Design an enzyme around this catalytic site. Structure first.
Site, PDB file in Angstrom:
ATOM      1  CD  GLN B 171      -2.727   1.268   2.478  1.00 10.14           C
ATOM      2  OE1 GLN B 171      -2.413   0.628   3.480  1.00 10.14           O
ATOM      3  NE2 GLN B 171      -3.778   2.077   2.448  1.00 10.14           N
ATOM      4  CG  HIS B 175      -1.429   4.417  -1.826  1.00 13.09           C
ATOM      5  ND1 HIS B 175      -1.706   3.111  -2.161  1.00 13.09           N
ATOM      6  CD2 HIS B 175      -2.600   4.955  -1.409  1.00 13.09           C
ATOM      7  CE1 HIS B 175      -2.987   2.866  -1.946  1.00 13.09           C
ATOM      8  NE2 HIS B 175      -3.552   3.969  -1.491  1.00 13.09           N
ATOM      9  CG  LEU B 352      -3.301  -4.932 -11.602  1.00 11.62           C
ATOM     10  CD1 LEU B 352      -2.355  -5.631 -10.632  1.00 11.62           C
ATOM     11  CD2 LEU B 352      -2.851  -5.175 -13.030  1.00 11.62           C
ATOM     12  CE1 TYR B 353       0.259  -3.871  -5.443  1.00  9.39           C
ATOM     13  CE2 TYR B 353       0.998  -3.518  -7.690  1.00  9.39           C
ATOM     14  CZ  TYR B 353       1.246  -3.943  -6.401  1.00  9.39           C
ATOM     15  OH  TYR B 353       2.484  -4.440  -6.066  1.00  9.39           O
ATOM     16  CG  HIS B 356      -8.902  -2.941  -0.617  1.00  9.89           C
ATOM     17  ND1 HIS B 356      -9.151  -2.451  -1.880  1.00  9.89           N
ATOM     18  CD2 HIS B 356      -8.286  -1.942   0.059  1.00  9.89           C
ATOM     19  CE1 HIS B 356      -8.718  -1.205  -1.959  1.00  9.89           C
ATOM     20  NE2 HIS B 356      -8.190  -0.871  -0.795  1.00  9.89           N
ATOM     21  N   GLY B 494       0.029  -7.905 -14.282  1.00  6.17           N
ATOM     22  CA  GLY B 494       0.667  -7.010 -13.333  1.00  6.17           C
ATOM     23  C   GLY B 494       2.169  -6.864 -13.507  1.00  6.17           C
ATOM     24  CB  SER B 498       5.502  -4.511 -11.469  1.00  2.00           C
ATOM     25  OG  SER B 498       6.421  -4.437 -10.392  1.00  2.00           O
TER      26      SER B 498
HETATM   27  C1  COH Z   1      -2.257  -2.761  -2.665  1.00  2.00           C
HETATM   28  C2  COH Z   1      -2.579  -2.881  -1.374  1.00  2.00           C
HETATM   29  C3  COH Z   1      -3.614  -1.980  -0.648  1.00  2.00           C
HETATM   30  C4  COH Z   1      -3.843  -2.069   0.669  1.00  2.00           C
HETATM   31  C5  COH Z   1      -3.155  -3.026   1.672  1.00  2.00           C
HETATM   32  C6  COH Z   1      -4.855  -1.104   1.026  1.00  2.00           C
HETATM   33  C7  COH Z   1      -5.351  -0.895   2.297  1.00  2.00           C
HETATM   34  C8  COH Z   1      -6.403  -0.072   2.642  1.00  2.00           C
HETATM   35  C9  COH Z   1      -6.862   0.193   3.996  1.00  2.00           C
HETATM   36  C10 COH Z   1      -6.169  -0.465   5.222  1.00  2.00           C
HETATM   37  C11 COH Z   1      -6.595  -0.401   6.490  1.00  2.00           C
HETATM   38  C12 COH Z   1      -7.912   1.036   3.904  1.00  2.00           C
HETATM   39  C13 COH Z   1      -8.795   1.664   5.008  1.00  2.00           C
HETATM   40  C14 COH Z   1      -8.126   1.320   2.499  1.00  2.00           C
HETATM   41  C15 COH Z   1      -9.102   2.143   1.973  1.00  2.00           C
HETATM   42  C16 COH Z   1      -9.106   2.686   0.704  1.00  2.00           C
HETATM   43  N1  COH Z   1      -8.353   2.242  -0.367  1.00  2.00           N
HETATM   44 CO1  COH Z   1      -6.893   0.762  -0.293  1.00  2.00          CO
HETATM   45  N2  COH Z   1      -5.228  -0.437  -0.124  1.00  2.00           N
HETATM   46  C17 COH Z   1      -4.494  -0.940  -1.183  1.00  2.00           C
HETATM   47  C18 COH Z   1      -4.608  -0.501  -2.491  1.00  2.00           C
HETATM   48  C19 COH Z   1      -5.397   0.535  -2.967  1.00  2.00           C
HETATM   49  C20 COH Z   1      -5.239   1.163  -4.263  1.00  2.00           C
HETATM   50  C21 COH Z   1      -4.185   0.803  -5.337  1.00  2.00           C
HETATM   51  C22 COH Z   1      -6.335   2.243  -4.338  1.00  2.00           C
HETATM   52  C23 COH Z   1      -6.650   3.235  -5.489  1.00  2.00           C
HETATM   53  C24 COH Z   1      -5.469   4.176  -5.718  1.00  2.00           C
HETATM   54  C25 COH Z   1      -5.918   5.571  -6.095  1.00  2.00           C
HETATM   55  O1  COH Z   1      -6.444   5.791  -7.225  1.00  2.00           O
HETATM   56  O2  COH Z   1      -5.726   6.487  -5.257  1.00  2.00           O
HETATM   57  C26 COH Z   1      -7.032   2.149  -3.074  1.00  2.00           C
HETATM   58  C27 COH Z   1      -8.097   2.938  -2.710  1.00  2.00           C
HETATM   59  C28 COH Z   1      -8.641   3.049  -1.452  1.00  2.00           C
HETATM   60  C29 COH Z   1      -9.617   4.033  -1.032  1.00  2.00           C
HETATM   61  C30 COH Z   1     -10.235   5.144  -1.910  1.00  2.00           C
HETATM   62  C31 COH Z   1     -11.384   4.571  -2.732  1.00  2.00           C
HETATM   63  C32 COH Z   1     -12.148   5.678  -3.415  1.00  2.00           C
HETATM   64  O3  COH Z   1     -11.857   6.874  -3.152  1.00  2.00           O
HETATM   65  O4  COH Z   1     -13.057   5.362  -4.225  1.00  2.00           O
HETATM   66  C33 COH Z   1      -9.895   3.816   0.255  1.00  2.00           C
HETATM   67  C34 COH Z   1     -10.890   4.635   1.110  1.00  2.00           C
HETATM   68  N3  COH Z   1      -6.457   1.141  -2.302  1.00  2.00           N
HETATM   69  N4  COH Z   1      -7.193   0.629   1.756  1.00  2.00           N
HETATM   70  C1  LIG Z   2       7.377  -8.479 -11.564  1.00  2.00           C
HETATM   71  C2  LIG Z   2       6.743  -9.801 -11.176  1.00  2.00           C
HETATM   72  C3  LIG Z   2       7.334 -11.016 -11.512  1.00  2.00           C
HETATM   73 CL1  LIG Z   2       8.831 -11.079 -12.400  1.00  2.00          CL
HETATM   74  C4  LIG Z   2       6.729 -12.204 -11.140  1.00  2.00           C
HETATM   75  C5  LIG Z   2       5.540 -12.187 -10.432  1.00  2.00           C
HETATM   76  C6  LIG Z   2       4.956 -10.980 -10.093  1.00  2.00           C
HETATM   77  C7  LIG Z   2       5.548  -9.782 -10.469  1.00  2.00           C
HETATM   78  N1  LIG Z   2       4.989  -8.512 -10.140  1.00  2.00           N
HETATM   79  C8  LIG Z   2       3.598  -8.246  -9.975  1.00  2.00           C
HETATM   80  C9  LIG Z   2       2.612  -9.067 -10.500  1.00  2.00           C
HETATM   81  C10 LIG Z   2       1.274  -8.761 -10.315  1.00  2.00           C
HETATM   82  C11 LIG Z   2       0.911  -7.620  -9.620  1.00  2.00           C
HETATM   83  C12 LIG Z   2       1.889  -6.791  -9.103  1.00  2.00           C
HETATM   84  C13 LIG Z   2       3.227  -7.103  -9.279  1.00  2.00           C
HETATM   85  C14 LIG Z   2       4.281  -6.180  -8.709  1.00  2.00           C
HETATM   86  O1  LIG Z   2       5.499  -6.465  -8.830  1.00  2.00           O
HETATM   87  O2  LIG Z   2       3.941  -5.123  -8.119  1.00  2.00           O
END
Ligand code: COH
Ligand SMILES: Cc1c(Cl)cccc1Nc1ccccc1C(=O)O
Ligand code: COH
Ligand SMILES: *[C@@H]1O[C@H](CO)[C@@H](O[C@@H]2O[C@H](CO)[C@@H](O[C@H]3O[C@H](CO)[C@@H](O)[C@H](O)[C@@H]3O)[C@H](O)[C@H]2NC(C)=O)[C@H](O)[C@H]1NC(C)=O
Ligand SMILES: *[C@@H]1O[C@H](CO)[C@@H](O[C@@H]2O[C@H](CO)[C@@H](O[C@H]3O[C@H](CO)[C@@H](O)[C@H](O)[C@@H]3O)[C@H](O)[C@H]2NC(C)=O)[C@H](O)[C@H]1NC(C)=O
Ligand SMILES: *[C@@H]1O[C@H](CO)[C@@H](O[C@@H]2O[C@H](CO)[C@@H](O)[C@H](O)[C@H]2NC(C)=O)[C@H](O)[C@H]1NC(C)=O
Ligand SMILES: *[C@@H]1O[C@H](CO)[C@@H](O[C@@H]2O[C@H](CO)[C@@H](O)[C@H](O)[C@H]2NC(C)=O)[C@H](O)[C@H]1NC(C)=O
Ligand SMILES: Cc1c(Cl)cccc1Nc1ccccc1C(=O)O
Ligand SMILES: *[C@@H]1O[C@H](CO)[C@@H](O)[C@H](O)[C@H]1NC(C)=O
Lengths: 551, 551
Positions: B171, B175, B352-353, B356, B494, B498
Site C-alpha cells: 500500500q 501509493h 488490479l492493485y 483489499h 501485473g 511493475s
Molecule cells: C495494494 C494494497 C492496498 C492495501 C493493503 C490497502 C489498504 C487499505 C486500507 C487499510 C486499512 C484502507 C482503510 C483502504 C481504503 C481505501 N483504499 Co486501499 N489499499 C491498497 C490498495 C489501494 C489502491 C491501489 C487504491 C486506489 C489508488 C488511487 O487511485 O488512489 C485504493 C483505494 C482506497 C480508497 C479510496 C477509494 C475511493 O476513493 O473510491 C480507500 C478509502 N487502495 N485501503
Molecule cells: C514483476 C513480477 C514477476 Cl517477475 C513475477 C511475479 C509478479 C511480479 N509482479 C507483480 C505481479 C502482479 C501484480 C503486481 C506485481 C508487482 O510487482 O507489483
C-alpha cells in the site's frame, strides 16, 4: 572546488572528495586513470580508425556521381542514414541530466520540465574564474565582443545559397521548442513538450488550443481575406498575442505561438501551416465521413507533426548539411537499434541556434524594400502582397553567412549581447570544453579558431587565453567550412541535438509509426511524400516554385 | 461503430472506414489477414515453442535445488533475469498510447500527464453493450457482485504466508504512483512523475518538499518523541494532510503523501523511510564534509530511490512471485538491450492493485486487537507501541488471500464496489479482452475461470456470458495458482506494469547508474546491499527480525 578545472576527460564525472581532492568516475567512458585520459585497447583502435569530422564532411560534400549511385541503392542509403542517426544520437544523454542549477545528477534536474537541460554542467559557483580556472577574473564586456567581432559592416551572403524561406523556416520551426520563459530567467522554458509537438500552431495548453479551434470538422479558426485563408484574430479567439499598441485590432492575428506576430515571415509560415491543417481535415473527412470533430483534429495534428519531421530532415537539414548523400526520414531505420524515444531541449542547442547573421539589411517583397522599422510587427505587408508573392520573393532573396564573424545586423545587435550575457548568467563552460564534449580537438590558438589574423587578435586582446573564449561568440567567428554557412563546431554540436528532437518524437516509435495512427494509408502517405515544395504547392495560390536555396 | 466487437486480434489496431466497415492494421503484429488472425511463418514457430505461463510458473516454483545452483552462477542468473525484464516489458507500449478519453492515438493522450494511460483503449461510446457487443445492455448491479462474490464470509489466510509488513509495504509503495485525482475523475492522477520518484516521502511539488525539509545537512524535518525519530507535525511544517477534525494537533503527522495519516501501518513505513533518509544524509556528510545541504538532500533521495527499487525487486516481488529463482536488481542487464527509460502509470495497473482482501478482520499490535474504527486515523496507536513493536507484530500477523474470491472485509466493502463502478466509468474492456492483450487464452466458461462451482454459477447468473465478465471481479474470483496468493491473470498482467515502472526509472539508465551519481562507492553500495531487513535493522530500535512472510 577542485572540479573547477574540469580535470575529468572523455565524459568522466568529476566529484569532490573532501575539500582539496576530487575523484573522476570513468564508468563506461572507454578510458581509465585519475582523469580518465588513458584509453582502453578497443578505444585506441576506435580512435585510430575514426576519420576526422572535416574529412567526413569533405567526402559527403564531394564525389557527387558516387553519391548518386549510393542514393539509388536503398540497402546502402538506409544503412548510412541509420548510422548517421545512431552515431550522432549517442552524444546526447537521454533521459537528460544537468540543468543551470545542478552540476550533479539530481531528481530536481531530471524531473523539472520547466528547465532547459544541459549537455555540460554549469561552472561551480565558487571558482577562481567565471569559466573555471582559465581566463581573467572578469569576462570581456558583452558590448565590446559584439562590436568588435560580431557586428555587420558589409553584408556577407551565405555561400550555400540559403534564402529567406530557409531563414524564416528556421525561426518558425525552432521557436516551438525554443521558448525562453523570461519571467523566470534564461534557464527556463515554456515549451514543456520539449520537441516537435507543433504547439506553435495549436498552442501549448489545452485552453489555448480550444480558443484557436473551430470545433467543426476538426478545423482551426480562420478568416477569408481577398479570397484566401488567414489565421483568426485575438478578438475572435481571445487567444493572447504579443503586439505593440500601434497594431490595429483587426490585424492582430492569433496563432499557436504568442510571439509570431513579430515578423511577417513568421506569420507567413503560420498561415501556410494553418491552411495545411484544414486541408488535411478535408482529406480525412473524405476518408472518414463517420469521424467527429475531435478525431479529425487530433489525427490531422499527428499528420502535420510527421510532415514537419519529414520536411526538416529531407529538405531543411539536407540543404543545411550540403551533403550529396540524400538524407531520409524513416523511423524503421531505428527499430532494431537502441534508441530512446524522448527528448529534453538543451540550453546550448538554443544558444547555438541564434542565427541572426542570416538576416538581411532589408526585406524585398515583390518590388518593394522594407527596413526593420517598417517590416517588424507589420501584418498589412502580408495582406498587401499575399502568401504567393512572399514565397516567390523569399525564395529569391539570399540570406547571410552565419559563421565567419562580423555579420550580425545592427538592428538585432542587442539580441547578440543578450545571448552572451544570458550564457554567463547560466554559467556556460568554455568553447573548448564544448568541443571536447562533442569529440572535437580543442583549438590551440585564436588564429586556429578564425583561420585569420584580424579577429583572432581582437579575441586574444579580449580573452588572452584560447580556453577562455565563450561558446556563442566562438561559434560565429569560427572559420567556416569551405564555402559553407557554418564552421565545424556548429555542425558537430548542433546535429546531435537536432536528430534527437526529430527521431525522439513519439510518432517515430514502433507503437505509433503505422497507417492506423494517421487515419489510414492516405494520411500516412501525406507524411511520407511531404516536402517544402508540396507544402507550398498545396496551400499557396498558384503553386509557386520554392526551395531553401536561391535559384 | 463496427470496432465495438473488438474484431482485430493480436494487437492489431481497429479503425472505422465509413459507417459500416472496419480495418485492421496488422503492422508488426506477427499476423496478417482481415482480423490479424493468420500467423506469419516465424510467428508459427515462436507460438509452437512458447511454453504456457502456468508451465513457466511451475518450473520457477519447483526444483529448489536446481535454482539454488543457478542463483550462484552469475552468468546464468543474469541471463535469466535479463530475459524476464525484456520479455515482460515488450507487453507495454512505451511511449504510452491510449487513455480514458482516447481509444485512438492522439497527441492529447500522449502528452497530457494528468491521465492514467491505458493498455487497452476504452470501449467506444455508442456500442450495443457497455463492453462492446457481449453481455446484456446493462451491467449487473455492482453491490450484488460484491456481496455474492467478493465479500468475506470467513477469513481466508494467504497460503504463501504474506504478512502485514507485506500488506502495508504494498500500500505504502504503490501509493506514490497510484494517486487518483477524485475531484477530476477516476481517469486522472496527481502523480505526474508516473513511477518511483518517492513523492510520497518528499512531496509531489517543490513547494511541499520545501515545507518538509530541514535545510540543514540535507535532512528532512522530524520530531523526537520517546527518544525516537518521527515525522514532523502539520503545525510545524504547514504541509497539508488529510485528518478528520478529531485528530489533535500533535498527532497530525506530516509526510510526502497527503493521505498517509489514514492508517498507522502507512505512517510506520513513512517513519522508517524518513529515518533512512536522514541516516543516508549522515553517511554522505562523512563522505563529503564539503557538500552543502542541497546536494546532500538530492543525493540521498537518489540513493533512497535506489534502495526502494532494490527492495521491491529482490524482497517484495521475490516473495510475491513465490519463485525459487533469485530475482536481481541490476540495470546493467539492460544496457545491451532495447528498452525505454520512461514510464506512464496504467489505470488497469491501478485497478488490479486493489488488494483489499489482504486486510485482516482486526489489527493485532502486541497483545492488543484493534478493529477498523479504532485503527484508522489513529496515530496514537503508533506512539503507544512504537515502531519496533509494530514491526514485531506485523511480521507475525498473516494477511488474507487475494484470488479465490469472497475475502474482502466488510469494512472496505464500498471500496470494492468503487473499483467496479469507477472501471465502468472509464469503460474498461472485458476480462477476456485483457487476457488476450497479455497473450493469455481467454476463459471459455465461468467454471474454468474459478475452478469451482458456487461462484461460477453466481457469475453466470450475473453476467450470463463469460466474455461479459468485468476485469476487477474476475481477478479476485480467479482460480489461484497452487497455494499461491494470486491467479494467473493478476501476475501476467501485473508484472509488466511493475517491471516497466521499476527499470524504466531514470537512475537505471547508463548515464545515471554510476557511483558518482550517488556520492561515490559508499553511497552506491547502500543501494546494492539494501533489503527490507536492513532497512528495518538500520532504522528500528533493537533491530528486530522482519520479512514479508510470517515465521
Ligand atoms: C495494494 C494494497 C492496498 C492495501 C493493503 C490497502 C489498504 C487499505 C486500507 C487499510 C486499512 C484502507 C482503510 C483502504 C481504503 C481505501 N483504499 Co486501499 N489499499 C491498497 C490498495 C489501494 C489502491 C491501489 C487504491 C486506489 C489508488 C488511487 O487511485 O488512489 C485504493 C483505494 C482506497 C480508497 C479510496 C477509494 C475511493 O476513493 O473510491 C480507500 C478509502 N487502495 N485501503
Ligand atoms: C514483476 C513480477 C514477476 Cl517477475 C513475477 C511475479 C509478479 C511480479 N509482479 C507483480 C505481479 C502482479 C501484480 C503486481 C506485481 C508487482 O510487482 O507489483
Ligand atoms: C534560428 C533562426 C532565427 C532567426 C532567423 C531569427 C530572426 C529574428 C528576427 C527576424 C527579422 C527578429 C526581429 C529577431 C529578434 C529576436 N530574436 Co531571433 N531569430 C532566430 C533565432 C532565435 C532564437 C533561437 C531566440 C531565443 C529563443 C528563446 O529563448 O525564446 C531568438 C531571440 C530573439 C529575440 C529576443 C532574445 C532575448 O530577449 O534574449 C529577439 C528580439 N532568436 N530574430
Ligand atoms: C489534460 O486534460 C484535462 C482534461 O481535458 C485538462 O483539464 C481540462 O482543462 C480545461 C481547460 O483548461 C477545463 O476547461 C473548463 O474550464 C474553463 C475555465 O474557463 C471553462 O471554459 C469551461 O467550464 C471548461 O469546461 C476543463 O474543465 C478541464 N477538465 C478536467 C477534467 O480537469 C487539462 O488541462 C489537460 N492538461 C494540459 C496540460 O493541457
Ligand atoms: C521547477 O523549478 C522552478 C525553479 O526552482 C520552481 O519554481 C519555484 O517554485 C517555488 C515554489 O513554488 C517558488 O517559491 C517562491 O514563491 C512562493 C510563493 O508563495 C513564496 O513562498 C517564496 O517567495 C518562494 O521563494 C519559486 O519562486 C519558483 N522559482 C522560480 C524561478 O520560478 C518550480 O516550481 C519547479 N517545478 C516543479 C514542478 O516543482
Ligand atoms: C506596413 O506596410 C504597409 C505596406 O503594405 C505600409 O503601408 C503603405 O504606406 C505607404 C506610405 O504610408 C502608402 O502609400 C501605401 O498605400 C501603404 N500601403 C497599404 C497597403 O496601405 C505601412 O506604412 C507599413 N507600416 C509601417 C509602420 O511602416
Ligand atoms: C486510538 O487508539 C488509542 C490507543 O492508542 C485509544 O485510546 C485508548 O482507549 C481505551 C478505551 O477507550 C483506553 O482504555 C486507553 O487508555 C486508551 N489509550 C490511550 C493511549 O489513549 C483510542 O480509543 C483509539 N481511538 C478510537 C477512536 O478508537
Ligand atoms: C542533423 C544535421 C546533420 Cl545530419 C548534418 C549537418 C547538420 C545537421 N543539423 C544541424 C546542425 C547544426 C545546427 C542545427 C542543425 C539542425 O538540424 O537544426
Ligand atoms: C590529472 O589532472 C591533474 C590536474 O588536476 C594533474 O595534476 C594530474 O597529474 C593528472 N593525472 C594524470 C594521471 O594525468
Amino acid at each position: 572546488n577542485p572540479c573547477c578545472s574540469h580535470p575529468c576527460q572523455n565524459r568522466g564525472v568529476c566529484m569532490s572528495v573532501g575539500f582539496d581532492q576530487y575523484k573522476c568516475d570513468c564508468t563506461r567512458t572507454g578510458f581509465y586513470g585519475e582523469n580518465c585520459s588513458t584509453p582502453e585497447f578497443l578505444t585506441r583502435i576506435k580512435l585510430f580508425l575514426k576519420p576526422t569530422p572535416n574529412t567526413v564532411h569533405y567526402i559527403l560534400t564531394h564525389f557527387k556521381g558516387f553519391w548518386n549511385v549510393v542514393n539509388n541503392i536503398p540497402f546502402l542509403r538506409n544503412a548510412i542514414m541509420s548510422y548517421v542517426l545512431t552515431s550522432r544520437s549517442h552524444l546526447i544523454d537521454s533521459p537528460p541530466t544537468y540543468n543551470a542549477d545542478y552540476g550533479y545528477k539530481s531528481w530536481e534536474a531530471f524531473s523539472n520540465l520547466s528547465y532547459y537541460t544541459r549537455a555540460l554542467p554549469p561552472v561551480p559557483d565558487d571558482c577562481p574564474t567565471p569559466l573555471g580556472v582559465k581566463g581573467k577574473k572578469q569576462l570581456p564586456d558583452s558590448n565590446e565582443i559584439v562590436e568588435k567581432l560580431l557586428l555587420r559592416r558589409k553584408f556577407i551572403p551565405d555561400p550555400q545559397g540559403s534564402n529567406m524561406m530557409f531563414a524564416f523556416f528556421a525561426q518558425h520551426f525552432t521557436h516551438q521548442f525554443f521558448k525562453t520563459d523570461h519571467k523566470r530567467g534564461p534557464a527556463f522554458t515554456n515549451g514543456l513538450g520539449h520537441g516537435v509537438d507543433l504547439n506553435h500552431i495549436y498552442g501549448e495548453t489545452l485552453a489555448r488550443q480550444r480558443k484557436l479551434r473551430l470545433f467543426k470538422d476538426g478545423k482551426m479558426k480562420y478568416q477569408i481575406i481577398d479570397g484566401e485563408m488567414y489565421p483568426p484574430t485575438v478578438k475572435d479567439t481571445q487567444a493572447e498575442m504579443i503586439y505593440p499598441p500601434q497594431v490595429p485590432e483587426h490585424l492582430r492575428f492569433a496563432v499557436g505561438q504568442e510571439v509570431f506576430g513579430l515578423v511577417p515571415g513568421l506569420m507567413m509560415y503560420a498561415t501556410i501551416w494553418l491552411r495545411e491543417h484544414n486541408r488535411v481535415c478535408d482529406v480525412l473527412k473524405q476518408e472518414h465521413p463517420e469521424w467527429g470533430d475531435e478525431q479529425l483534429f487530433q489525427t490531422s495534428r499527428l499528420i502535420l507533426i510527421g510532415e514537419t519531421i519529414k520536411i526538416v530532415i529531407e529538405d531543411y537539414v539536407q540543404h543545411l548539411s550540403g551533403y550529396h548523400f540524400k538524407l531520409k526520414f524513416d523511423p524503421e531505420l531505428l527499430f532494431n537499434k537502441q534508441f530512446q524515444y524522448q527528448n529534453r531541449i538543451a540550453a546550448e542547442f538554443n544558444t547555438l541556434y541564434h542565427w541572426h547573421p542570416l538576416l538581411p539589411d532589408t526585406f524585398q517583397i515583390h518590388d518593394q524594400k522594407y527596413n526593420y522599422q517598417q517590416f517588424i510587427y507589420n501584418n498589412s505587408i502580408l495582406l498587401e502582397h499575399g502568401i504567393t508573392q512572399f514565397v516567390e520573393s523569399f525564395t529569391r532573396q539570399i540570406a547571410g553567412r552565419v559563421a565567419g564573424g562580423r555579420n550580425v545586423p545592427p538592428a538585432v545587435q542587442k539580441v547578440s549581447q543578450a545571448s552572451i550575457d544570458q550564457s554567463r548568467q547560466m554559467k556556460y563552460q568554455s568553447f573548448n570544453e564544448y568541443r571536447k564534449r562533442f569529440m572535437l580537438k580543442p583549438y590551440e590558438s585564436f588564429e586556429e579558431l578564425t583561420g585569420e589574423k584580424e579577429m583572432s587578435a581582437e579575441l586574444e586582446a579580449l580573452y588572452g587565453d584560447i580556453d577562455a573564449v565563450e561558446l556563442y561568440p566562438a561559434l560565429l567567428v569560427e572559420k567556416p567550412r569551405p564555402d559553407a554557412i557554418f564552421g565545424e563546431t556548429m555542425v558537430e554540436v548542433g546535429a546531435p541535438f537536432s536528430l534527437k528532437g526529430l527521431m525522439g518524437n513519439v510518432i517515430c516509435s514502433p507503437a505509433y509509426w503505422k497507417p492506423s495512427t494517421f487515419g489510414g494509408e492516405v494520411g500516412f502517405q501525406i507524411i511520407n511524400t511531404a516536402s517544402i515544395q508540396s507544402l507550398i504547392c498545396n496551400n499557396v495560390k498558384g503553386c509557386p516554385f520554392t526551395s531553401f536555396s536561391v535559384p
